[PDB]
Amino acid sequence: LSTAILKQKNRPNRLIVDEAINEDNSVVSLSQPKMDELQLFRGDTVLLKGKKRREAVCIVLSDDTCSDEKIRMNRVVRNNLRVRLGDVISIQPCPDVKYGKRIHVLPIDDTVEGITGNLFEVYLKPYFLEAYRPIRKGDIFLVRGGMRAVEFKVVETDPSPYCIVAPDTVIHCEGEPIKQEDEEESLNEVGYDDIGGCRKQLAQIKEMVELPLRHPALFKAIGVKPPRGILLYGPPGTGKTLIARAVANETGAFFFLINGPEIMSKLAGESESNLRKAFEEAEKNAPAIIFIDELDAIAPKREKTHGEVERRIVSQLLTLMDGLKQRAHVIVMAATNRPNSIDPALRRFGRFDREVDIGIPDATGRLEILQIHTKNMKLADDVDLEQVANETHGHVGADLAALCSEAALQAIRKKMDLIDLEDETIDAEVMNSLAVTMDDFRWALSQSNPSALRETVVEVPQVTWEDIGGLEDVKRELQELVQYPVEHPDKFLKFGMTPSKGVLFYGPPGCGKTLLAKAIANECQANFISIKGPELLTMWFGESEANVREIFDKARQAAPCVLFFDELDSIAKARGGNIGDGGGAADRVINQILTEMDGMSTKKNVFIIGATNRPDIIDPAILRPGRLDQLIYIPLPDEKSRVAILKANLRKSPVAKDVDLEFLAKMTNGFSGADLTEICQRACKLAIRESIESEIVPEIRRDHFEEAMRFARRSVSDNDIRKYEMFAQTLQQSRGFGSFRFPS
Amino acid sequence: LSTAILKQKNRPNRLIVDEAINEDNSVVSLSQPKMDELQLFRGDTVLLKGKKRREAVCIVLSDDTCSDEKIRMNRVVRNNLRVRLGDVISIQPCPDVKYGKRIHVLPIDDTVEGITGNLFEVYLKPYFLEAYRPIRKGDIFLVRGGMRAVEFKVVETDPSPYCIVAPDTVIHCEGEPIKQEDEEESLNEVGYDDIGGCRKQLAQIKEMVELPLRHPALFKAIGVKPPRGILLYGPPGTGKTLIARAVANETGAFFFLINGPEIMSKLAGESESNLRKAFEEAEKNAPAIIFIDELDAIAPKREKTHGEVERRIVSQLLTLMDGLKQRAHVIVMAATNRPNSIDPALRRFGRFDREVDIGIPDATGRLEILQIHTKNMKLADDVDLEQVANETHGHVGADLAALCSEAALQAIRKKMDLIDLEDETIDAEVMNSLAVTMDDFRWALSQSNPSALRETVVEVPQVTWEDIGGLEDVKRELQELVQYPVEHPDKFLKFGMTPSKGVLFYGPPGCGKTLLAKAIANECQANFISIKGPELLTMWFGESEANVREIFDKARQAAPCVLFFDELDSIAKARGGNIGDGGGAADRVINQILTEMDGMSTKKNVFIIGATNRPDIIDPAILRPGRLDQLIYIPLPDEKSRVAILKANLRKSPVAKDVDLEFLAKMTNGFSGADLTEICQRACKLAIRESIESEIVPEIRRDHFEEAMRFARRSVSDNDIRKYEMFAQTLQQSRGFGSFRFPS
C-alpha cells in the first residue's frame, strides 16, 4: 500500500553486472540465457536506453576466448554509460532496417600529434574485421590499442531516422573536442540517486521550480505569485552547491553560477558590472535559474558595513532583487552558512522570502551518502556501511567523502608499498585487485576530524517504547497529549478546548525522564532537540541569554519537533537551592524561555518537554496554566517494573539462560533505572577482563553478576524519596473532593 | 442612523455574476429577466460604467447554444473591466443614434510576426457576421480564436460624441502598444476596496493630500500651512508601498517613486544628481507627489555615519527638504521599518513633521485582506475566511498573500499530480475545476512562518463584560473613571478636579485582574497594550531599562489606548520579596515607569492599569496621589459569583442540561477563577478521550465532571487570604470616622 505504487522492479529484462578483467573493446562476450529467455534479436545498432538514453552499442558473437556464462566488459563503465547504481536499463532491439550513410568522427588528442597524411590507411582501415562499429547519434565509444583515451559527442543532428552504419566513408576533422566539464555536468544531473540525507529538502525545493519552469502558462492563468528567492542553509560541507546544480540540471534550465569571492575580487566598479550583466543575460535565456555560491561574502551587512565599495555592491544586489517585476521566468537562489550572517534587507518579501534549511544528515541519511562515493570502487565481502553510518554522527556530506578517500589511500600503502618498483607505468593488475576492508575504515575514522560537532543535533531518536523498562502508566499519558491534537484537530475545536503546550517531568534522578521524551518523538516521527544542563548554564555564566531565541527558531521551522530541557533546575542549584541567594527563583535564562514560550503559536506542532530532579526549586512562574499544565511524576520501579529494565538493557549482550533475572530484581529494592544499568555495565566488563586474561568463553555466565554485586550503588536513598512524596500530595490536595456525587 | 447615509444598495439595476465555461467572445448569452424588469433597450454601443467608467460592450441575442436563464461570459473578467468585488455597476442605454466613422486599432504582438500584405482579407474581413464589434473610446475588448492575448487602449481623442461604429474602414499600424505596468497601475488605484486593516491610517493620510492637491486655491486664502512630509511606519510587509501608490493614483497626481537602494547603488557623485533632478522634475509637473521607498537605506544617520559619500547624500536630502519654500504643490512621503533607524534631523519641522504609524492588522482587519487575494479564484462551499483570520494573529499583509499562494499551490499537486501528462499545452478544463478547500489552508497555516511575532500586539480585545463571571461591584468602578472624563470633560473642569491617571488591581492570583483590564478597553473601544511579567524581567536582567520609553511612546500616539502591567511586582519577587536584598523596593524598571508616568500629559486619553498578586512588596512610591490613586481589591468569588463563572466558561462547550452548575458551585468554596477554568478544561479532555477510544457521544454528560473532580486544585489557600485581609484594613483605617455627622 505505502510502497505499492513504487513497484517497477522484477522485470525479466535484466542483466548481470560484474567487475572487468579484459580491456579489449573489439572482443565482447556473449550471453546465452539472455538470448533465450528474452526477445533480443540480432542487429548492428540496437535502440537501448536506461540512463538519459545514453548507452553503448557493440557487436556480439565474439566469445569463446576467456570464459562462458559470465560476460566481460571494459572498465570504462565507471564513468561512461553509467552514473550510479539503482538505475534501470531498458533494451529493445529494432531489427530489419536498411544501411545508413555514416556517423561523423570527433578527434580528441590523437589527431594533433603526428602526421595525418590520409587518416584512413594509418590506423583506421586495418582495424575493421567482422565489426562495423555501430555508432548512434550521441553515444560514447572507446576503442584503442594503447593509451586508451578518446571521447565522442556530436552536436549536429543531420539524420532523423535510425539505420545501420557502414565503413569506407568520407570524414573530416572539423569537430569541437569537448572538455571535462561537459562530461561532469551530465553526472551532476541528480534527482535523488546521488543525494543522501536530503529527502525532505529536495521535496520542498523541487516543487518550487518544477511548475514555474516546466509550466510557465500555469501561474499566468491562476492568481498565484511564484517565489523569486530561495535561500539555502547548512554548515559548510553539507552540499548546498551540489543540490542547487542537480536541481538546475534536472529541470533543464539556463544555469548561471555566480561565485561569491569571484565578484568581490574584481577592481573598483568592475564588480558593479559583473552582477548587472548576469541578470540581463538570464533574461534573454529564459527560463533560467541563478545561483549565488557565497551570499554572506557579498552582502554581510549585519555589523561589518565598512567601505564605500562593498556597500555599493550590497545596494546594487538589493536593487537587482526587487526590480525583477515578472519580465522573465528567472529564479534567484543563494547559499550561506549561518542565518545570522545575512543582510536583513534580503529577508524581506520579493527578495528572499523562502528559506530552506539543509541540516546534518542522520544515521539513515549518512548511510545513503556512503553508497554514493563508494560505487566507483569495489569493497571486500566483510565491508558493511551500516556500522560506519552509526559510528559517524558528527560528519557532513563532505566529511564522509574525505573519510572514503582516506580509507582508499590506507589500502594503497599497505598492500602496494611492498612492491618497491618505482615505474612510471605501473601494472593494471594491482589497482583493480586493491580491496578496501574494515581495517582501513577503522583507522580512517580514528584519524578523521569531524567538522559538525558544535552544531545542535536535530534527528529522530532510534529508541522506542520497548527500551523503557516498565512504567506503563505514563506511556498512555504522553500518547494522549501530543498525538490527539495532530490526528483529530476537529475534536479539540468542537469542544473549544485548547491542547496543552508542554509537560514537566519531575522525580528522582536516573529513572527514565529522557527515554520517555525520546520514545514519544520516535513514535510521532518528529524531530528531537535536547538541551542539556551545561547548555543552560553556559548561557547564564556568559551573561548571554539571547541564545535561547535560536533554540525556538530552529524548532518551529523544523516542524513537527519536540523540545526537551534536561535538568531545567540546573541554574537554581548553581546559585544555591534550598537556601539560595537573596533573591527568589527567577533568572535570565528561564525568563527568556518563558518569553519565547508565551509567544509560540499553538497551531504549529512544536511540543516542549521539561525534566527536573528538584521540583522544590522550580520557578512557580513556569507552571501557570498555559506553559506547563501537566506534571508527571516518575517513581522508582517496583518489583513489576525492574524485571523489564533488565530485559531491555541486556538485549545487546549475550546473556545465558542460566541467569535468573526475577530473583535479581527481587533483592534490588532501592535501585533506580540508572542504578541497574551500571550493574550490567560492570558485569559485562568482567567478561571482557576474563576473556583477555584467558587469551594468553563467548557467553557471560552467572558468576560475573554475583561478582559485580559487591559494588552495588544506590544513588537514590530513602531520605530523598520523602520530599517527593510530600511534594506530590502538596500539588494534589484532593481531600474531601473524593466523594463528590451529584444529588439528581 | 450610523450606516443610514451609506445606503446605495438595493437598486433594481443589477445582474448575476458567475464563473465561466465558454471562451468565445462572439457568442454572448441573453438574459430574459433583465430585458423585462429593467429598461435596457436595444443598441450597438451602450454607455455603461461602474468602475472608472471602464466596461466592455458586446452584441447580444446570440443565445440558444449552451443554456437558458444563466448568462455566460469570458474568463477575462478577472483582470479586465473589473478590479475587485464590492464595486457597483451602472448601465444606461443610449439608443436612437446615428452611425459613426470608426475607432482605431492597436496591434500588440500579432502584427509583427507574419506577413501583413493587406491586413484586411487575412483575418479581419472573414470574422464579421451579424456583429459590428461596437468599440468605445478607451474600452478593452479581447476576441481571438486561439492564443487569445490582445489589448486595446487609445490616447488620441478624435471624436467628441458617441455613435455606432461600422466595419469596412481604413486603419493603420501607427499605434503604441501598452506594456503591463500601464495595466497594473490602474489596479493600484485603491480607495479602500483593496486595502484591509488600515481604515484609520487611510482616514488620516488621505485628508492630508485631498485638500492641498484637489483644491490648491484653498490654503492660498486661509492662513494654514499644509504638511510637507508624511512618514509611514510598520514592519516590513505591512503594505507601506501599496498605500502610498493607491493614494497617489486615487488623487490623480504626478507620482515619482524614488527607491532606496536604487540611489545608493550609483557611482560616486551620480546619486547626488538623481536626487537633485527628481524634485525639479516634480516642480514642473505640479501638482506632484514624491515617495521614498527606503528612507533608512538613504539616511541612516543615527550611529553609522561612515564615509564621505553617504553623509553627502544625507546632507543633500536635508538641503532638498527644507528648501521647498512653497514653490509648487509637492508633498514628499517616505516609508521605513522602525522609528529608531531614522536621522533625527528629518524629525524636525518642515521636513517630516507628520508621522503615520501603520500597525499589524487585527482579527477584523486580516479578514478583509483575505478577501483581496482570494477574489481572482473561487473557493469551495466549505471554505470560510472567518476562522483563518482568527487563527493567524502574527501575520502581516504580505504573510496572508503568501499563505494564499501556498494554499493554492497545495491543491495543484494533490488533484492534478495524478494526471501524469507532461504536455506543454495543458487542458483548460482542469485549472478552472481546481477548488481550494479547508484542508489546503490547514497545511498552509502549519507550514507558514509568521514574521510579526516579536512585535507588541496592539489591538482591541474581543472579550466583553459577559465573559467576566460575577464581580458586579467593580464593573461600575471602572466605568466611572475612564468613561466620564472622555464623555463629559466639562464636568471635571467645572469643579476643578483632575481625573485619576491610573488604577492598581491587587488580590489573590487567578481572579480576573486581566479580564477587567481587557473588558473596559473593549467597552471604551480603545487599544490595549499588555506588558507581561517576563517582559519587565527582560529589561531588568539585561540592564536595559531604556526600553520602557517605547512602551509609552507607542501608547500615546495610538490614542485612545490603555496600558496594562501584568504582575507589576514580578521584579520584587525575583530579588527576594518579604526578606529581599539589602535594599528597599526600588529598581531601574519601576523607576523609569514612574519617570515616564509623571511626564505623561493628562489631557490625552492614555489610561494605565496595574495588576499585582503581592501588594506587600509593591513600592509605596507608585501609590502617591497622581500616579495610582485608586486601589481595587478583587476577592475570591462567593456563592453568588461562581455560578456566573461556569455559565461564562462553558459557552464554547456543548454541555448538556443535565449538569447542575448550582450544586457544582456550592461545594467549590476555596476556588478562584483560574481554579474553576482548569476543571472545565480537564472535563472537556475526558470527552475527547472517550470519543477517540469509542471510535475504534457528541455531547458531554455529567460523569466527566464527576471524574475530573478527583483532580481538584486549590491554588489559593486560607493562609494567603489572611494577609490580604490584614492589608485591606491597613490601607483603609476608617475607625471612628464612620459616625461623622455635622451638627447644623
Ligand SMILES: Nc1ncnc2c1ncn2[C@@H]1O[C@H](COP(=O)(O)OP(=O)(O)O)[C@@H](O)[C@H]1O
Ligand atoms: N548530500 C550529499 N550527497 C553527496 N555528496 C555530498 C553531500 N553533501 C556533501 N557532499 C560532498 O561534499 C562535496 C562538497 O560539497 P559542497 O557542494 O561544497 O557543499 P558546500 O558548498 O555547501 O560546502 C561534494 O562534492 C560532495 O561530494
Ligand SMILES: Nc1ncnc2c1ncn2[C@@H]1O[C@H](COP(=O)(O)OP(=O)(O)O)[C@@H](O)[C@H]1O
Ligand atoms: N525504564 C527504564 N528503561 C531503561 N533504562 C532506564 C529506565 N530508567 C532508567 N534507565 C537508565 O537510565 C539512563 C538514563 O535515563 P534518564 O531517564 O536520562 O535518567 P534521568 O531521567 O534521571 O536523567 C538510561 O541510559 C537508562 O538505561
Ligand SMILES: Nc1ncnc2c1ncn2[C@@H]1O[C@H](COP(=O)(O)OP(=O)(O)O)[C@@H](O)[C@H]1O
Ligand atoms: N493592507 C494590505 N492590503 C493588501 N495587501 C497588502 C497589505 N499589506 C501588505 N500587503 C501585501 O504585501 C505586498 C506589498 O508589500 P509592501 O507593502 O510593498 O511591503 P512594504 O510595506 O515593506 O513595502 C502586496 O502584494 C500586498 O498584497
Ligand SMILES: Nc1ncnc2c1ncn2[C@@H]1O[C@H](COP(=O)(O)OP(=O)(O)O)[C@@H](O)[C@H]1O
Ligand atoms: N470572573 C471571572 N470570569 C471569567 N473567568 C475568570 C474570572 N476570574 C478568573 N477567570 C479565569 O482566570 C483566567 C485568568 O484570569 P486573570 O484575571 O488573568 O487572573 P489574574 O488576575 O490572577 O491574572 C481566565 O482564563 C479566566 O477564565
